[PDB]
Amino acid sequence: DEITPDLWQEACWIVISSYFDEKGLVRQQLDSFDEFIQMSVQRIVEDAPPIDLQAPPRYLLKFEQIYLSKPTHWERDGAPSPMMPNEARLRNLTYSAPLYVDITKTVIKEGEEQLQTQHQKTFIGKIPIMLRSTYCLLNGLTDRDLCELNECPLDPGGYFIINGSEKVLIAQEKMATNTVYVFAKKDSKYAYTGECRSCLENSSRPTSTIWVSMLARGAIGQRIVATLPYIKQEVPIIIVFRALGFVSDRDILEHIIYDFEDPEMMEMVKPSLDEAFVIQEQNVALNFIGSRGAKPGVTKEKRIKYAKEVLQKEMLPHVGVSDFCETKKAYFLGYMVHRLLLAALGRRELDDRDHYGNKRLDLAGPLLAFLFRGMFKNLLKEVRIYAQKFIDRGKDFNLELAIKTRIISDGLKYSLATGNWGDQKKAHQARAGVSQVLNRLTFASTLSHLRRLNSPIGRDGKLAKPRQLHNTLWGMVCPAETPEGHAVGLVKNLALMAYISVGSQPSPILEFLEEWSMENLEEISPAAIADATKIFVNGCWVGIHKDPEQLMNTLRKLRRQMDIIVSEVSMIRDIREREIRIYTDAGRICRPLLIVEKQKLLLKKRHIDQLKEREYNNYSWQDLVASGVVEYIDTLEEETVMLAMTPDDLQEKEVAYCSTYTHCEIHPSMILGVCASIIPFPDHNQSPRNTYQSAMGKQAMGVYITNFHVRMDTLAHVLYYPQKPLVTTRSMEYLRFRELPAGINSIVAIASYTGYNQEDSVIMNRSAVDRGFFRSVFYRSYKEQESKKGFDQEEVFEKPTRETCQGMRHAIYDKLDDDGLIAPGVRVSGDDVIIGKTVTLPRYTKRDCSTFLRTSETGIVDQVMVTLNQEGYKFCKIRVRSVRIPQIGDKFASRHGQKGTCGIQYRQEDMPFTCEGITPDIIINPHAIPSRMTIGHLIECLQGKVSANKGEIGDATPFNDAVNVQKISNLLSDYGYHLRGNEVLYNGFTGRKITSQIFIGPTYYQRLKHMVDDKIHSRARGPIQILNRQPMEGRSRDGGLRFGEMERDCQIAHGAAQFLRERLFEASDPYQVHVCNLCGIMAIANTRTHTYECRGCRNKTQISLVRMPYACKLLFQELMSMSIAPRMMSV
Amino acid sequence: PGFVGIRFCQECNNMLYPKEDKENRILLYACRNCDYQQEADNSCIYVNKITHEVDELTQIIADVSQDPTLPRTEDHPCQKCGHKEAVFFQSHSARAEDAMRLYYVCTAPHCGHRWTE
Amino acid sequence: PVPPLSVRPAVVMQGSARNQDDLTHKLADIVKINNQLRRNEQNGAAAHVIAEDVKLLQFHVATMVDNELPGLPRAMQKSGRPLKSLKQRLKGKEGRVRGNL
Amino acid sequence: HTTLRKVTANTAIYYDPNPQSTVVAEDQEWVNVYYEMPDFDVARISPWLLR
Ligand SMILES: [Zn+2]
Ligand SMILES: [Zn+2]
Ligand SMILES: [Zn+2]
């Protein structure tokens, strides 16, 4: 029955494999989008108010149902055919499906003359579709079906195709809503502040933040204030309580202080009462609120109405926005004050801003919902204006012409295309970085980009606290994978078994709590709240309970049985403070864990047995979760959980550590993400090395996707001979690194050989490189289109001619065909022409606008595709193919942060060799190891020697006590090798033995995208910028290198004044001006007629020539634009 | 000394503020909303414990013994019920510097005795 | 003072559409409101109308030489991007002095 | 620097109408040892005490 330790390493990984058979790696994206389409769009459409318009006749126009068909593309002819994602990629279409809404317009004029007209399936917009979602044409297709459609079966999906560009929505971090968080700002007028970003269940407005603060000590005592929304002045809490109908101080403290035996709380609230005694009735308090507001009505009536509306709608919407909710709002605001007092009295800890239990991940669904709310509101507005301008004339109108569908369509398309998350007009208030271009450089880069999280703290911020690896990231975020540049700690990555909750309605839970012995908050007396336990659901205090323990037992039983409580519902019992917080909302990152009985796992051997035959008896992960054996625990419920790292922790020990565990890790290696799960032996490296590899696995070459032959990507690198690593971890089985690997096993020798590998460089074998070692192919796609925008000027693909075309370069166009497009198989060098495009003029009647190769490439045309774009003019894509043979300067890396460029390449006779004539493919310098402490590199090399000599794949899973260095060495000594991986090598040049026995063996190396040929650049008098006549910027522009301020300072320190003048004047922008010797302002010179005159001074004899930079002339002219007179006085 | 609690009027249920009656030279607690008055019984109006000599045993609740994440010990039996097992934990409360002190709670149900060594 | 064409070059795009500089668009606004104010003072206009026109002219000139005025709205252009005034042309890094001199 | 708070244990306000019979019982010894001779203006005394 029990899984014994000897079977555990199989059982756990069997369980893990079942998880990845059920979910995958992009499950969060697909589930978010599916919830958005199934629920969020319908909720948004129904939550909009019916637009009642009347001059008389009236019309309501109620939207009642939505229909999202499959993605479809319509041609000029109008025939209807399904649009496949690959066709969208090739034709630069948007993989979107039409959204139709049912509309009901009832005519009501008078005399009960009512009649309803329903417009079924009114086309309301187009919604882009996430690939492999339920509403994707690739849904449920087999691998054969996907290959029939020219799709990769290993492609995870989880992205959109907007204008042929694959866009991926990055999950955005945000502070959780409807939760009270008591912080303390050191530099502020308030000692403690308790904030609550409140938002109603079905979002319709932004988060309304309410603060309840305490004024810092230094009138008599500490005063509690409340910064309500839409009010620009602090308001005492007692005033707010009275404005809600609680005038008696006893009632207010009944709502705030639940234990009247506690004078400390009492004296700390007393200043607030003493400050609010002149106001003692609800109307006067409402008048005070309205007066403190930023729109103080001259008459107290409208002041009181405004205060009523604010306190009913903007104050704590999550508690309830309807009327008669003042009791719930009063209880909740009293809870906020109670929490603030507990913090000020030291009875509760301040809340941690960085705790991921306090955060939420805004995924594709809830982000598209924000867009859709804004866009549907704008659409209903436009419909209101259109219908108003017609009914004002007293006649009917056609809603089909009122609905301008471009709002929703173009809005979603623009937002996903650019990443600016918001309305196109508010292009600066909008937050960019959402919806990035999917990284297709290697399969690991694609997976990681699809599992990418973002902390929008702002890269400019230099506070390290949000960048720090918090304790609560354990199991939810990769500890290693993070960019090492300016976004350290802000851009994160999901751990492998991390699941972001999609969201759920609290209705069944609330109904069960009602049927259960919970007492509502309006029905109780406050005297009961002392000993009772509060119950919050999605932040709303809904009631109280008397035995929280058996309530938690009941709820956990219900969630483990897949009863009314779904698996993703978090249920935290804080014991010391008697809250029970239940969460069903979306964005809660959680992970699966094995539940533990008294001191035993519930995962018995029968579950492993049924999981082994997963493909026959359809016993899956969901059956494991439904059995009550596995549980999803979120960051906030982990605080109440006692984990076992392994079932070995559940053994009874000579001194028991815990003996009351509640859960167990499925495997600790699941704390790593996609790119860190490729590192072998990451627990033997320094952690920065693991981070650098997690970044560098994403630039590694491989086969980024199986269907690369049909993709017209702008840039693509494919390795000739990708190999799976000889030394692998058990997590790559689910990353599909074995099916799409990104490196080669290289016989690497760590040695000092000729000095060409010093300081992070490598010596490669020229003979190996000749045999296809780390050879790659580079595919570059050029796009072009001939626009017939108007009869004024039209472009067209056609072989240009020297007699008709004007802007025709001296490059030869013979490689083009009569259609103007080069043919595949044609070898093209730099500056060559691949598309001959000519544009009609207003060298006559047509000018050359041909597409050249990006300079200095020298490839062969791989293929040419011609089609029609969305509007329907001819559209061409040409993929050119360039074989990249590794060379000096190309960057290579192992899986341990050990990067370096090729210093030199030696032939096989020049490389050092073992007694059996094995030469290293790569030689790396021993000095790269000691400071870096990448012992995982050495253990991987030794394990790889054992694996190659044994005919297996080494197990480098991080935390594995069945694999240590002594075992690997003992294994290697059985194959006739030195047990530590050393060998006697001979000098290739002289054949003499090397005195020091070299450490050599197979290690998995990666070829990175950074090849020297894509970086080398030179300039000598090339093109210049228009504004300031200085060299351009970039290799692509043939630009010059920037001689910056620091270079100026260095050369000033050198004392090199002529070199400094050469760099900053003569090699950048030499120029001449003519200055009036009297006024010092630039004069008018006419060198052809030799007439120089200053219009200002009315002189034409006292002019002087001045040699100045063009940028300085431009500066002085831009100062004269500002009415400044910079007078260059030559005397 | 001990703290002093707030007391409310019997008519308007607002807090009673302190006042002095010169005629009898006696402390009274009177409401500044209604016209109620009361004869005080403590004679102390304000108390500040600067030292903050708070007995944290009063802040503990027996329910904490149900926490699976707290450590348990068999070495400190309960003086009230004789149960062997007991959870222990530190103060973890602000304004307490010498907070390495351990507080124990009996894990027996319905006993919930709390103490300190 | 309206600068010359070198300070605000009209760059030609791939086709024939000549795109004007931000300074040129701003000067267009300034000349528009200046002519509008000139006619409104010359012909029938209310005092408050002339006042509004003068206020708008002030806004245009100020945002031509300095666009980041606190409180005031930023001078806008097509695509919703604020215009680059003479001050941002040389305010700091990547300006004339640090970025080109 | 040492303020009275750094060395103070606890402050309290009492309503002591006559110092001869104090509100507290343990402070009756030294208060009478101080009051049996008139050191200050006993008439200019307020019943509010700050111990
Ligand atoms: Zn002059
Ligand atoms: Zn009263
Ligand atoms: Zn006990």
CA of residue B117 to ligand 3 center, whole Å: 15
Of the partner residues C11, C14, C79, the one whose CB lies closest to the CB of residue A849: C14
Helical H runs in A244-363?
249-256, 263-275, 282-292, 300-309, 326-344
Q: A89 Cβ partners below 8 Å, 6+ apart?
A: A161, A164, A166, A711, A712
Nearest one of A74, A73, A69, A79 to A121, comparing CA atoms: A69
Do residues B61 and B101 both lie within one domain? yes
Q: A250 Cβ partners below 8 Å, 6+ apart?
A: B8, B13, B14
Q: At what angle do helices A326-344 and A263-275 cross, to 10 degrees?
A: 120
Q: A723 Cβ partners below 8 Å, 6+ apart?
A: A741, A743, A744, A745, A1004
Do residues B56 and B27 both lie within one domain? no
Taking CB atoms and an 8 Å cut-off, how many pairs form between chains A and C?
59
Contact B48 D10 (CB under 8 A): yes
CB A762 within 8 A of CB A900: yes
Q: Which chain C residue shows the shortest CA-CA distance from A1120?
A: C1
Domain count, chain B: 2
Q: b or e along C66-101 (b: 16 or more beta carbons within 10 Å of the residue's beta carbon)? A: bbeeeeeeebeeeeeebbbbbbbbbbeeebbeebbb
Q: How close does chain B come to D14, measured CA to CA in Å?
A: 4
φ/ψ (deg, to 5) at A367: -80, -45
Q: C29 Cβ partners below 8 Å, 6+ apart?
A: C60, C75
CB A1116 within 8 A of CB A1128: yes
Contact C96 A1111 (CB under 8 A): yes
- Full 3-state SS string of B21-87: ECCCCEEEEECCCCCCEEECCCCEEEEECCCCCCCCCCCCCHHHHHCCCCCEECCCCCCCCCCCCEE
Identify from D2, D14, D45 which residue to disrupt to test chain B contact, counting B C-beta atoms within 10 A and taking the largest count: D14
CA atoms within 13 A of residue C8's CA, in its CB half-sphere: 20
Catalytically annotated residues of A: 760
Nearest one of A998, A993, A962, A994 to A978, comparing CA atoms: A998
Torsion of CA A552, A557, A560, A563, to 10 degrees: -110
φ/ψ (deg, to 5) at A897: 75, 5
The two beta strands, A96-108 and A452-454, are unpaired
CA–CA separation, A34 and A369 (whole Å): 12
- Full 3-state SS string of A263-285: HHHHHHHHHHHHHCCCCCCHHHH
Do residues B36 and B65 both lie within one domain? no
Local structure of residue A1040 (DSSP, 8 states)? P
CA–CA separation, A426 and A431 (whole Å): 10
CA–CA separation, A726 and A747 (whole Å): 11
- Note down the domain range covering B26: 1-48
Do residues B39 and B4 both lie within one domain? yes
CB B40 within 8 A of CB B27: yes
Do residues B77 and B115 both lie within one domain? yes
CA–CA separation, A26 and A800 (whole Å): 48
Q: At what angle do helices A27-35 and A364-391 cross, to 10 degrees?
A: 20
Residues of chain A neighbouring C16 (CB-CB closer than 8 A): 793, 842
Q: Which chain A residue shows the shortest CA-CA distance from C3?
A: A1121
CA–CA separation, A960 and A983 (whole Å): 28
Nearest one of A950, A945, A934, A1003 to A979, comparing CA atoms: A945
Do residues B71 and B107 both lie within one domain? yes
Contact A428 C89 (CB under 8 A): no
Of the partner residues B5, B59, B93, the one whose CB lies closest to the CB of residue A266: B5
CB A330 within 8 A of CB A241: yes
CA–CA separation, A933 and A273 (whole Å): 63
CA–CA separation, A693 and A894 (whole Å): 8
CA–CA separation, A957 and A672 (whole Å): 11
Identify from C5, C7, C12, C84 which residue to disrupt to test chain A contact, counting A C-beta atoms within 10 A and taking the largest count: C7
B15 touches chain A (CB under 8 A): yes
Query: What six digits make up the tokens of A579?
Result: 């809250």
Contact B46 D47 (CB under 8 A): no
- What 3-state DSSP class applies to A123? strand
CA–CA separation, A674 and A678 (whole Å): 7
CA of residue A1100 to ligand 1 center, whole Å: 9
A1050 touches chain C (CB under 8 A): no
Q: B97 Cβ partners below 8 Å, 6+ apart?
A: none
Do residues B53 and B42 both lie within one domain? no
Left (φ > 0), alpha (ψ -120 to 50) or beta: where does A75 sit? beta
CA–CA separation, A117 and A119 (whole Å): 7
CA atoms within 13 A of residue A478's CA, in its CB half-sphere: 31
The CB density around residue A326, as the number of other CB atoms within 10 Å, is 18
Nearest one of A810, A849, A811, A806 to A828, comparing CA atoms: A811
C93 is in an annotated binding site: yes
Do residues B75 and B100 both lie within one domain? yes
CB A97 within 8 A of CB A72: yes
Identify from B13, B72, B88 which residue to disrupt to test chain A contact, counting A C-beta atoms within 10 A and taking the largest count: B13
Q: Give bridge partners of residue A95 from the DSSP assignment.
A: none
Do residues B12 and B39 both lie within one domain? yes
Neighbours of chain A (3+ CB pairs under 8 A): B, C
CA–CA separation, B56 and A594 (whole Å): 36
The two beta strands, A744-750 and A643-644, are unpaired
Of the partner residues B25, B40, B51, the one whose CB lies closest to the CB of residue D10: B51
CA–CA separation, A529 and A514 (whole Å): 17
Helical H runs in A668-790?
687-696, 732-735, 766-770
CA of residue B9 to ligand 2 center, whole Å: 4
Placement of tokens 């030794």 in the chain: A942
Query: What six digits make up the tokens of A7?
Result: 């079977």
Placement of tokens 């609120």 in the chain: A289
Q: A162 Cβ partners below 8 Å, 6+ apart?
A: A94, A95, A128, A413, A416, A417
Left (φ > 0), alpha (ψ -120 to 50) or beta: where does A249 sit? alpha
Nearest one of A831, A836, A834, A829 to A811, comparing CA atoms: A831
Say which ligand is closest to the CA of A250.
2
E strands, A546-673, where? 570-573, 580-583, 589-595, 630-634, 643-644, 663-664
Placement of tokens 């009177």 in the chain: B30
Distance of CA A426 to the CA centre of its chain: 21
Distance of CA A346 to the CA centre of its chain: 38
Torsion of CA A333, A336, A337, A338, to 10 degrees: 120
Distance of CA A738 to the CA centre of its chain: 26
Local structure of residue A424 (DSSP, 8 states)? S
Placement of tokens 């459409």 in the chain: A45
Contact C7 A1114 (CB under 8 A): yes
Residue at A548: amino acid letter = P
Nearest one of A937, A919, A918 to A928, comparing CA atoms: A937
Query: What six digits make up the tokens of B75?
Result: 């070495």
φ/ψ (deg, to 5) at A99: -105, 120
CA–CA separation, A771 and B24 (whole Å): 113
CA–CA separation, A273 and A1073 (whole Å): 76
CA–CA separation, B92 and B69 (whole Å): 15
CA–CA separation, A536 and A179 (whole Å): 9
CB A882 within 8 A of CB A829: no
CB A341 within 8 A of CB A192: no
* Domain's final residue, options B48, B65, B86: B48
Do residues B39 and B69 both lie within one domain? no
Helix (H) or strand (E) segment spanning residue A239 = helix A237-243
The CB density around residue A961, as the number of other CB atoms within 10 Å, is 8
Of the partner residues B25, B45, B50, the one whose CB lies closest to the CB of residue D5: B50
CB A92 within 8 A of CB A163: yes
Residue at A948: amino acid letter = A
Nearest one of A568, A585, A561 to A499, comparing CA atoms: A568
Contact A1121 C86 (CB under 8 A): yes
Do residues B33 and B55 both lie within one domain? no
Taking CB atoms and an 8 Å cut-off, how many pairs form between chains A and B?
67
Q: b or e along A795-833 (b: 16 or more beta carbons within 10 Å of the residue's beta carbon)? A: bbbbbbeeebbeebeeeebebbeebbbbeeeeebeeebb
φ/ψ (deg, to 5) at D22: -75, 160
Placement of tokens 């005034």 in the chain: C85
Do residues B67 and B16 both lie within one domain? no
Contact A263 B5 (CB under 8 A): yes
Determine the Cα angle at A499 with ends A498 and A504, to 5°.
Answer: 155
Q: b or e along A101-126 (b: 16 or more beta carbons within 10 Å of the residue's beta carbon)? A: bbbbbeebeeeeeeeeeebeebebbb
CB A633 within 8 A of CB A593: yes
CA–CA separation, A113 and A975 (whole Å): 97
A with B: touching (≥3 Cβ pairs within 8 Å) = yes
Q: B86 Cβ partners below 8 Å, 6+ apart?
A: B65, B72, B73, B76, B77, B78, B104, B105, B106, B107
CATH number of A181-361: 3.90.1110.10
